[PDB]
Symmetry: D2
Subunit: 466 residues, 4 copies
């Protein structure tokens, strides 16, 4: 067997090695056809119909482009076809762990439904990957193409989730750079972002300001602190700052859209009210809940955006409350956006504090009185992907005149117009009562609360609260 | 009220009148979010994740663009906002009737599951539309914006499905041109095509060779045989031929892709095996089947691509056979392509004949025995949307020097490189049994059947 | 009625016959022979676009915005007269550009006529006047209901700002209740105007770079409201993040393309060649009077003939007088370019002023390194990065409205939007190049540069 | 030496080998920056500002993509880096011979100004290429990267123009025959030049874009065909190849043969004719040439670009007044006037205006017209091989037998394809623009159509 070719609108005609095809053609992978990339975003941006599946193809492709580019430019690195395939597999599979409506699931639902657990989609991707390989007889196929499953499966997992002194077992320090491609734990510059920037922009109605292809052409491996790392050409540092600007633009405009988020929130609410009643059969016929399906991959395999429609179309009276919420989404009786503010302090509102926030807004004393249950307060952390840190400080560069010498480039060396801060918090407030009287009041509470807390004046404060 | 603005990747920022928004924000319309434009095409073209919903928005928008362009250019036509809204509503709603996996449903499943009925998605769109309006109190909202429901609802239905002498009740002969926008029964040149060309191309990675915005700018209404018709500028005729060429390119490459079609076929097969066991709740809690959900719009409202997953994820042993078929799709163990005939010019084989064809192939005795149930026979039409007729012969044009005089332009006036024929047919045959022995036999039956019928080719 | 033109950025554009009449003149068609990005084309092969097509785009977008406002707000009393005047101003604001666009007013004129104060905007106004007067356009304007005296003043004002002192309303062409009309083509209050929108889209299309700001969205959300007794265009409050993105895009385009090191050195070499050819090239102006490249700006009939063509005239000449200028252009073709020596790190604000630029090569040559080159051997390029208003934040000069009170204008400060935004809105850096390309000359130039950086207390290699 | 990277809007970031850069950075190549791809088309489609230069980069790039794809897929073909570079050079350089306003120059101006000569831009590309190599010391550079100049220069020329004087090629043997199919495919016209211009012209014109061209590369394979190794396409792809020529024809109808774009090319031609004697272009040894004779000396030709247009427009010399007036009429949009169209051989074209003037119409006329007053434009629409179907000259392979080449006939593909692959229209224009002259021109035209038949 040789290559399948797939026409992707973002990347064009992509060639896939038969081993990759084998992996793709499984229930575990094809599942991703039923999970929207942007979850509730589709309910705001009608072009955002794309699912995780096509995004995963893009990531595997780009991973392969980068590893190949490096091997061609730098034969001395001894990159093998085995390495290439392992990297591509990791790129293809890093999204395997996503649940219904993507980041809604691990960002909102699981934290509320299982506050005791620490779960991320990455962990899910690793478990789902195991289940995919084991269930479908992929290990012998891997061997048939020269992979060594013990080492390589560990390598692939490590590329997705990080380690399970050099903390990695799958490859040695002299292949360290291979771990920088798919999910770059040092600085977040990886092929996953490059695909989603291009793909989301295409579907969204926007065009990305950073070119992934250019970055691949200027990438080189250099020694950095006794590690072989991928470095970028010095010239490119402005582009990297642009990259994270784009990322942040995309968060502002789409991923954290005020209405997209409230729809994600309403879905989450509905999943919570349904969690006790929906049964998902896992291994050996054992029954799981939406919140526990993450403990068994056979059950998880069946957990997709379909759960939304299962609730919407149900007749069971136990689900009436969950069903009503989803019905309100369809009529567009959503909760109403009241305003946004930020903390002025460097200390951030912590996850445990979130719950108390509606009570606080209702407490504020500026026709109708409003209760805490009437308000929704959404805390959004916006940053450059590494909390307070500047990821560019964690990038190595090289100059044209000395390609092998890795260097750091500080923010002040690039521009004084860059951010002084790399992380912030936005508080959005919504009201569940939608009549004009309730809204006007909600506005008053909000502005008063912002003044009480010493938060930033909402942009429309003069108008909504004179 | 003021307009909602929606960012569409194909058309950019689109303004929607509140009455349209009211119609959109209903279970009946939002349903379209869960029906893929290209059905099983997504399983071949990974970018084709788009659903009927966004396409419907595009169609409504373009309908509005055209009606507005005409009203602005030609005040004498007396086009009202009422007309504009009715046209937009019809554009928004002409895809309402589509079922799971779009053309799979009315093209494959319903013909096999209810051969007695004559159902098209257009008829479904009309029934859905009625249900949408009645269920959601839209009529008073229509009146609030100056529409007259009895006439206008009839007008909207007529725009989608044709007439229910001047055969139309919704508008008189002096507004005839309004019927040419959304679903053009004279020649197929309408806004539905323009949206899907652009949108499908964007998602597929293919190119649209026809510029719809241009066509709108050069469109004019002129008197043609005592009717006021939309006419195109004379020099646009080459573009109209290109438009149908593009349509046909899109059919060859994507809509009738061999593997996209076989996946639609396998899905159909699974729906058939599940039809007796899946329940869809309709009005009053009554339970419907997949094949009968078309009789109750409350049940039809919930019939979407979701059924696929409901079968895939079931544990009921009665559904094991349907579930297995879908599982085979996931492993890529598909029904196998046996062969196709070379194209013949006739468009000989008619829709009613399709059902008998597998029996026929099985009947062939060539030089492992197979039954009719083992074969699938797919009749593929390539034409210019009006069977043997050239649709451009049914288009009126005007010249720059005499904008009010409508004229005809014949094929020979345009180019000798154009088609001599406007319709053709191919037959593809597939086998449900996938084991080498079964395949070899299927090939024999196929070749023999081709010889018996006087068709040709591998 | 209308001509239709297919533009790749905007699609099929309709033009009113008066506009067509203006376009179909030597003065306007001239713009076909002036590259948008000058020497950028020698770095970005897609950047073949000329000012002409950009101008059509600007006129179109001007018309889109004025129409959108008039449709949404009949109470503003926007007339077809106003629409046409705005479109004319949009079409014509690039008329004054010289060969290789910003090279000409940014580099060549300052070196060739240091005594003169000349900008392309001022050129646009003069060229506009010459276009109308030379081609009998005034009667055509009157035929479509324009009143030339008021409207020509209005059009000029829209391009260059007030022609006429403390102060309140400084414009004559339209009153305060039409103030918003001045915000469309060349927005002197904050730089948010249709010129940027077209060039963002067009430059990105040709460059292969990407625009992060959507102009058409901004038009749909734009509304006029009363602000300090003026009727001003206001943006929807939630669009403020997009406006910040717009200035980010602008700056991305400067960094990547408009101030590309090699694009700039190629502009410099062209400038040098024009300087060496200035005495020999003759351009016939009014009455047969002969002008030079540097004096063609004094007569619009001569200026009309001054385009990128001059480059090729010099390149393909055989006249021995032009040998020096020709050699420079030939070095461009062989890619034997003036050599990049180094640049400083950015320093906040725009400390070095335009007037100071000329002294800088003398200064670098004056530096005495511990380990010989003249001022004429060096080129020193001052590069400004800002938000288009020196040290000011342009968004502080934007009015907004909220959904719940569309008629009430408000201000939104930076800290209301994001803490990730710039603390500073302007910065500068200095690049140095050497005209002598041999290794010995280069090594020396590096020494002078490093020494000069140490002397001045600057930073970086 | 490493690669230069160039950002091209059509193809993205392109890598160029230093030898290619050395060829590009010459007066002979850079000249192409000053020649518009679509000539007078820019005066109708304002986005069509693109020049031959950027198109040439694209062609060199796509040539390299194809040759590399084949070498990677089929190691047994023994494709060397030498071959790759020679192919890329040929792709870069096949447009070198184009004159002012591209096809206007060899299609209109040279036939009218030097009817005795037989000149095409391809021949020009070969001569210019020789001049570029010899003038700039490129031969030693070629050797420095492993080329053998005598063979490889011949090979490059052959790729552009065909055989110079059984296997008729000297540059490569029969077992590398497929290499000759990449840059300028004389068998069927399917080559990288078309792929670039489709994408690029569409991007600039404002027609929409596709990637089918990269698709064709992925499915291309070399197979034995009649004892030659030829590039074959996957059977599946035959519909796409038909689409390719449909697109080509769409582009001709809409843009390349636009009625007004052509009349502008015609007016530019007319102006060049009236200026030909007065413009001097210095060639080798200081010898002076004309616009029409610059094609005899590559040093002079090097300097012949769209610039000539402006040189005429901006002149004050009274000898150039007639040429300058025509160009001025272009700017005021007072164009030669379209008289009509009617639905044969190249040699006949020049006699056609004389013939239309000879026609004696019945009608009483305000003015008599001469041959010099008429322009007659013969417009060929075809599939690039006159009457032949180029797909009949394409070899295909099937998935199950990749090494066996086969033919696929038109009737195997679709009955909706053209019955004819070539057609002609005649357009007539009048240089005199007053109403009296126009009315008369109409009469002559209609009468001429009746006289010739084909009314
Ligand atoms: N007039 C004019 N048209 C241009 C220009 N650039 C591109 N075009 C396009 O060229 C097309 C053809 O030129 P027209 O001036 O319309 O020529 P025509 O159609 O022969 O003459 P009309 O009968 O006046 O329309 C126009 O419709 C425009 O879309 C320009 O600078 N001036
Ligand atoms: N050499 C060359 N580069 C071009 C041309 N057109 C566009 N370019 C691009 O412009 C950039 C110009 O820089 P170079 O010629 O490399 O100039 P430089 O970087 O100072 O010189 P190097 O040190 O050789 O890189 C290149 O990297 C190309 O991407 C051309 O005609 N010749
Ligand atoms: N003509 C086309 N243009 C663009 N994309 C196409 C075209 N035909 C098919 N595609 C898309 C659908 C798929 O994503 C990809 C490959 O499809 P296709 O080439 O038809 O392969 P296939 O696997 O169906 O055929 P085979 O196995 O016979 O090679 O290209
Ligand atoms: N910055 C942006 N750029 C591009 N598209 C956007 C941007 N912001 C939102 N969109 C998209 C999402 C929707 O399809 C459409 C309208 O969104 P938006 O203006 O955010 O409306 P909204 O209904 O949330 O706000 P409001 O009701 O306050 O006007 O535009
Ligand atoms: N089929 C087409 N598709 C896309 N663009 C086109 C097409 N035909 C022409 N154009 C472009 C070129 C111009 O910029 C614009 C208008 O051209 P076009 O309509 O052909 O000529 P014209 O408008 O001068 O004819 P007329 O004056 O007779 O109306 O559209
Ligand atoms: N940030 C960018 N984004 C997109 N294109 C760019 C960018 N910077 C430059 N380009 C374009 C212009 C050129 O066509 C091509 C290469 O330019 P660039 O990388 O700046 O090389 P250079 O030759 O100027 O630098 P060096 O020789 O130092 O590598 O890419
Ligand atoms: Mg296949
Ligand atoms: Mg809203
Ligand atoms: Mg015209
Ligand atoms: Mg360089």
């Amino acid at each position: 067997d040789t290559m399948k070719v797939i026409n992707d609108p973002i990347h064009g005609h992509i060639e896939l090695h038969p081993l990759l095809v084998r992996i793709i053609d499984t229930p575990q992978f094809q599942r991703l056809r039923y999970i929207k990339q942007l979850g509730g975003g589709y309910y705001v941006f009608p072009g955002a119909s794309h699912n995780r599946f096509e995004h995963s193809l893009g990531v595997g492709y780009l991973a392969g482009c980068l590893v190949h580019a490096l091997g061609e430019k730098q034969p001395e690195l001894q990159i093998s076809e085995r390495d290439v395939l392992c990297v591509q597999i990791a790129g293809l599979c890093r999204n395997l762990g996503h649940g219904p409506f993507s980041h809604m699931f691990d960002g909102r639902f699981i934290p509320l439904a299982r506050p005791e657990v620490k779960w991320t989609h990455e962990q899910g991707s690793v478990m789902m990957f195991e289940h995919l390989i084991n269930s479908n007889g992929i290990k012998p196929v891997m061997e048939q193409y020269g992979l060594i499953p013990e080492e390589d499966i560990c390598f692939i997992k490590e590329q997705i989730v990080g380690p399970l002194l050099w903390p990695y077992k799958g490859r040695p320090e002299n292949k360290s750079f291979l771990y920088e491609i798919v999910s770059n734990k040092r600085n977040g510059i990886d092929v996953d972002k490059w695909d989603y920037f291009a793909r989301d922009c295409h579907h969204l109605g926007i065009q990305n300001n950073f070119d992934y292809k250019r970055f691949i052409k200027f990438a080189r491996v250099c020694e950095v602190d006794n590690e072989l790392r991928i470095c970028a050409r010095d010239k490119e540092v402005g582009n990297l700052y642009d990259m994270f600007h784009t990322r942040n633009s995309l968060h502002r405009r789409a991923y954290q859209h005020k209405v997209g988020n409230i729809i994600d929130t309403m879905i989450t609410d509905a999943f919570l009210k349904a969690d006790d009643y929906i049964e998902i059969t896992g291994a050996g016929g054992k029954k799981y809940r939406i919140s526990t399906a993450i403990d068994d991959m056979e059950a998880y395999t069946k957990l997709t955006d379909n759960i939304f429609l299962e609730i919407l179309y149900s007749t069971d009276p136990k689900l009436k409350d969950a069903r009503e919420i989803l019905k309100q989404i369809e009529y567009r009786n959503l909760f109403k956006y009241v305003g946004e503010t930020q903390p002025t302090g460097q200390i951030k509102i912590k996850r445990e504090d979130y719950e108390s926030l509606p009570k606080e807004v209702a407490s504020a004393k500026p026709d109708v009185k409003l209760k805490a249950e009437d308000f929704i307060v959404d805390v959004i952390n916006m940053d450059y992907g590494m909390q307070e840190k500047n990821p560019i400080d964690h990038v190595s560069f090289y100059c044209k005149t000395a390609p092998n010498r890795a260097i750091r480039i500080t923010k002040n060396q690039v521009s004084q117009l860059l951010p002084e801060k790399f992380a912030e918090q936005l508080i959005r407030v919504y009201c569940k009562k939608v009549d004009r009287k309730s809204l006007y009041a909600a506005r008053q509470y909000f502005v008063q609360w912002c003044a009480d807390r010493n938060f930033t004046k909402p942009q429309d404060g003069d108008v909504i609260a004179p």
